[PDB]
Design a protein around this ligand. Structure first.
Ligand SMILES: Nc1ncnc2c1ncn2[C@@H]1O[C@H](COP(=O)(O)OP(=O)(O)CP(=O)(O)O)[C@@H](O)[C@H]1O
Ligand SMILES: [Ca+2]
Ligand SMILES: [Ca+2]
Ligand SMILES: [K+]
Ligand SMILES: [Mg+2]
Length: 987
């Protein structure tokens, strides 16, 4: 880790004593490693403070409860009398429910963070280095690179460690450093140094920082420093950590929380004033104050009982739960809002190569010209065996094993593939498998060149390592690659300028081009036949294109490329290299050589996932830069279209899409499910259109040309084996490239919603009748139904654990067989309000009808024969009874029925509109236990003598209880009825 960039190329190569072309010797590596250590970080310590997490105490509400707990603590203190045992209890009953949800949050929160870390501890980062033990680049675990050895980076790659740029192989090099500095834009770089020693990161345009991605280009440089010395390792924790705020569903719910904070605020202040007549009253110390005060409590307590203190805590929990379950499916959630959003995704756009397919390419069919005679064009089509990148396979013609070098046309075909290629193979001894280094497509051609071996290079006895690139190196050792005109989506082809070694064909300089067949074929005026050349003709050009199409729409839906070569390139001088736009011109007046057909197998889980998406109401769109024929073919075989379904206007190409007027483009986007040969920004535009219909859309990519779209989309989904550039722009990464998970994600995203909607229904319909209880008893002639503590109780027993458990609710019956939720759909439909009201009604008038019941019809206390003796003012009002109006017997019956009916109401929230018969309590084994935990806690307060006085008098076991269930249970049938109205009816 030499402390500088200041010095130039030579000083760093010399500082570590290494050749840029060979790189460290296995010995040096041993040394530098012991000396400098493993290039990693202690970072493996991220684990939020034991308590840092216990911050379930910050949401809007809850603070309310904490406040109410304060005023309860001050009142309970001063308040004199035979109290204290009931005065000081109130506060704990208010924060005990907070403590309860607090835990559940912290717990399901730890497990989440805990699983997200294991997802990363699986699949270590890799880097490409140049070591002396191998002639060609080799990939090693990044933790194993050390300062000094040569390293190679390129488009999409994530910079493995701080590096002094020694040389830029491409005609330009840009990179994304925003993560470190801030500068949101491809920043340029160059070889020379900059005098300023301890200068600011943002200036060193001769470095690459560990953690930044390469925007465009390819460069080789020497590791200036690793480990913590990294200008990203020291500036590690210092980052203020930009953890975005709440998610769209939380902002939606936190707002709906204060919407009640208001309504409730009224209910309470109101319930308060609608007293007074009892302020100066007897029962209240006889004073107006004690009377007013007692009622501020009836309000305060009523609030703390109506404010869903478990709402914020639940969204949180449920979310971390989604994350944890995605992690389990090897899916990395990089953004909290993902799952919830996929849940209501109307359309899923997806890249083809890599995303929809395995990207495991191999050349299986290839052809050159055999002979030409008039309108008849004979092609020499060969077949190749070997589906991996292994340099083991044979070239067959008429199914007989041929000597590829026998055909001059195949020699050139091989020459072109080897020289016009920025990739290579690397033998991974650990798995004994040949791996690619660079873009799949190109690598495929490298393995091909190895299989052809047009120069019969003796390779029977070479190391599995030395074999990997043997044949290629030979073609390279025979042609000097002057410069290469980088590949660009505009012209869809790449070129390379080569000079003969020791000048064989004299100054015979050539340009070897390879690209999308159509464009390359169009830029060909000559055809090569053996060593000969002839002008391109109508019958030949059609023949060449016919076989390609045959290959692209068949069983094998091959991916194809044309190989051509400019025999007489422009004078090296008249060519400018800092403007891609000019390159297509340089690649003209070409000579067609041949074509190669690659196998690129669709991922097995795709078709299935595509199907389920249909059922879910998800539209699936394929966007690619590949040939439309190959595209539509692949789309049929994947499930986007039917095997013989006409697609005249549901499949377009870049050109076609652009020829359409703005108005139609948008329509084409809602109609088409396949866009091919799309230009650069087309993927993004296509996501904009779908968003201009107010549709939650998602993009799925693997490479850099997906970044834009991935960011534009509401949800970006990236592939684990894709580039870091796409992964960055993405909000989720399928670590294992399992397309199915996306569907699993959208499902969990929906469940998470329904759950919140159920938690709300319960929490609401209950609490409504809860207050409906007061505004029907405290204003209908009946005596007080409950008192302070008695409210803080039901609260702590029906708004706590049993509700939060609704978060661990299973996915509804046909949740993933119903169309996506409109981005505008209201949180609570109107009928839903009726549903809450009806239930709120009954529960509210079966809690009051249970108090009166006792006084009347009940075989206890008075009997005031159906009339309650009309009023309460009796202090001969019949005077056949004492003051049974201040009896506890009646309240206990009230408090207990409210509680029981609420838990009964809870069982009505396992699903929105589903008969308990189909989805029984045991679908959510947690809700059950929770219920019991609350139920048991009730009995204890009801019968364990020390407690009863603090609350009320023990409702006679049996009879009294039987009466509770006889009026509570109906709530379960009442809503069960409401459900039958929406299920088997309404729709
Ligand atoms: N490295 C390369 N050199 C020469 N030609 C290439 C090339 N990579 C791709 N091509 C050609 O250019 C075409 C367009 O490339 P582009 O990246 O836009 O789409 P693609 O099919 O290569 C990847 P995707 O299907 O995931 O969008 C490719 O289909 C191929 O015909
Ligand atoms: Ca409450
Ligand atoms: Ca309640
Ligand atoms: K995005
Ligand atoms: Mg791709």
């Amino acid at each position: 880790m030499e402390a500088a960039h200041s010095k130039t190329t030579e000083e760093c190569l010399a500082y570590f004593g290494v050749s840029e072309t060979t790189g460290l010797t296995p010995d040096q590596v041993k040394r530098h490693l012991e000396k400098y250590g493993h290039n990693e970080l202690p970072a493996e310590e991220g684990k939020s403070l034991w308590e840092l997490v216990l911050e379930q105490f910050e949401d809007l509400l809850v603070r309310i409860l904490l406040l109410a707990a304060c005023i309860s603590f001050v009142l309970a203190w001063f308040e004199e009398g035979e109290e204290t045992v009931t005065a000081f209890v109130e506060p704990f009953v208010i924060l005990l429910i907070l403590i309860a949800n607090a835990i559940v949050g912290v717990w399901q929160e730890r497990n989440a963070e805990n699983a997200i870390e294991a997802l990363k501890e699986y699949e270590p980062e890799m880097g490409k280095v140049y070591r002396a033990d191998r002639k060609s680049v080799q990939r090693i675990k990044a933790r194993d690179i050390v300062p000094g050895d040569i390293v190679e980076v390129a488009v999409g790659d994530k910079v493995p460690a701080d590096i002094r740029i020694l040389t830029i192989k491409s005609t330009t090099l840009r990179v994304d450093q925003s993560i470190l500095t801030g500068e949101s834009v491809s920043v340029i770089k160059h070889t020379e140094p900059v005098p300023d020693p301890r200068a600011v990161n943002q200036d060193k345009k001769n470095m690459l920082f560990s953690g930044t991605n390469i925007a465009a280009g390819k460069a080789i440089g020497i590791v200036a420093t690793t480990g913590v010395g990294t200008e990203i390792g020291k500036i590690r924790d210092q980052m203020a950590a930009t953890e975005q705020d709440k998610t769209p569903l939380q902002q939606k719910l936190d707002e709906f929380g204060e919407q009640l904070s208001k309504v409730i605020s009224l209910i309470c202040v109101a319930v308060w004033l609608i007293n007074i007549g009892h302020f100066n009253d007897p029962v209240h110390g006889g004073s107006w104050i004690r009377g007013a005060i007692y009622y501020f409590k009836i309000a305060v307590a009523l609030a703390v009982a109506a404010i869903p203190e478990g709402l914020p805590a639940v969204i949180t929990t449920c979310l971390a739960l989604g994350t944890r379950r995605m992690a389990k499916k090897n899916a990395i959630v990089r953004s909290l809002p993902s799952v919830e959003t996929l849940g209501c995704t109307s359309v899923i756009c997806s890249d083809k190569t890599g995303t929809l397919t395995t990207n495991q390419m191999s050349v299986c069919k290839m052809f050159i010209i055999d002979r030409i005679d008039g309108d008849l064009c004979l092609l020499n089509e060969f077949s190749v065996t070997g589906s991996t990148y292994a340099p083991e396979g044979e070239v067959l013609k008429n199914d007989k094993p041929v000597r590829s070098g026998q055909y001059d046309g195949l020699v050139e075909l091989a020459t072109i593939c080897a020289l016009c290629n920025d990739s290579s193979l690397d033998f991974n001894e650990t798995k004994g498998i040949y791996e690619k280094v660079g873009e799949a497509t190109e690598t495929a051609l490298t393995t091909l060149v190895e299989k052809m071996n047009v120069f019969n290079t003796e390779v029977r006895n070479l190391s599995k390592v030395e074999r990997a690139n043997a044949c290629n190196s030979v073609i390279r050792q025979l042609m000097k690659k002057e410069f290469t005109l980088e590949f660009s989506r505009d012209r869809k082809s790449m070129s390379v300028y080569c000079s003969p070694a020791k000048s064989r064909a004299a100054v015979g300089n050539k340009m070897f081009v390879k690209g999308a067949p159509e464009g390359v074929i169009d830029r060909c005026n000559y055809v090569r036949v053996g060593t000969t050349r002839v002008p391109m003709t109508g019958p030949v050009k059609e023949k060449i294109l016919s076989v390609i199409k045959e290959w692209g729409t068949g069983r094998d839906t091959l991916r194809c490329l044309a190989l051509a070569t400019r025999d007489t390139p422009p004078k090296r001088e008249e060519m400018v290299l800092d403007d891609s736009t000019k390159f297509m011109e340089y690649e003209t007046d070409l000579t067609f050589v041949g074509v190669v057909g690659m196998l690129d197998p669709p991922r097995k889980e795709v078709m299935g996932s595509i199907q389920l998406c249909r059922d879910a109401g998800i539209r699936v769109i394929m966007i690619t830069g590949d040939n439309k024929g190959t595209a539509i073919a692949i789309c049929r075989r994947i499930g986007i279209f039917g095997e013989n379904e006409d697609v005249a206007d549901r499949a377009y190409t870049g050109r076609e899409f652009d020829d359409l007027p703005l108005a139609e483009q948008r329509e084409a986007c809602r109609r088409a499910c396949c866009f091919a040969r799309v230009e650069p920004t087309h993927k993004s535009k296509i996501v904009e259109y779908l968003q201009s219909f107010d549709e939650i859309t998602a993009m799925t990519g693997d490479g850099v040309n997906d970044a834009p779209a991935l960011k534009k989309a509401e949800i970006g989904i990236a592939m684990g084996s894709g580039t870091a550039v796409a992964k960055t722009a993405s909000e989720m990464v399928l670590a294992d490239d399992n397309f199915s998970t996306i569907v699993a994600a959208v499902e969990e995203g929906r469940a998470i919603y329904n759950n919140m909607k159920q938690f709300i229904r319960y929490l609401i319909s209950s609490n409504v009748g809860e207050v409906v209880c007061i505004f029907l008893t405290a204003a209908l002639g009946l005596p007080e139904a409950l008192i302070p503590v008695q409210l803080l109780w039901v609260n702590l027993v029906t708004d706590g654990l049993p509700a939060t458990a609704l978060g661990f609710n299973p996915p509804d019956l046909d949740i993933m067989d119903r169309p996506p939720r409109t981005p505008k759909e209201p949180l609570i439909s109107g009928w839903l309000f009726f549903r809450y009201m009806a239930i709120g009604g009954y529960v509210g008038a079966a809690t009051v009808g249970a108090a009166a019941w006792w006084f009347l019809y009940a075989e206890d206390g008075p009997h005031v024969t159906y009339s309650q003796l009309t009023h309460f003012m009796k202090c001969d009002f019949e005077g056949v009874d004492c003051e049974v109006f201040e009896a506890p017997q009646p309240m206990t019956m009230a408090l207990s029925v409210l509680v029981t009916i609420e838990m009964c109401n809870a069982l009505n929230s396992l699903s929105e509109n589903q008969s308990l018969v189909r989805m029984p309590p045991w679908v959510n084994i947690w809700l059950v236990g929770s219920i019991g935990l609350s139920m048991s806690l009730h009995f204890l307060i009801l019968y364990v003598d020390p407690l009863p006085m603090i609350f009320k008098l023990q409702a006679l076991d049996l009879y009294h209880w039987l009466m509770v269930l006889k009026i509570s249970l109906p709530v379960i049938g009442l809503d069960e009825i409401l459900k039958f109205v929406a299920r088997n009816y309404l729709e």
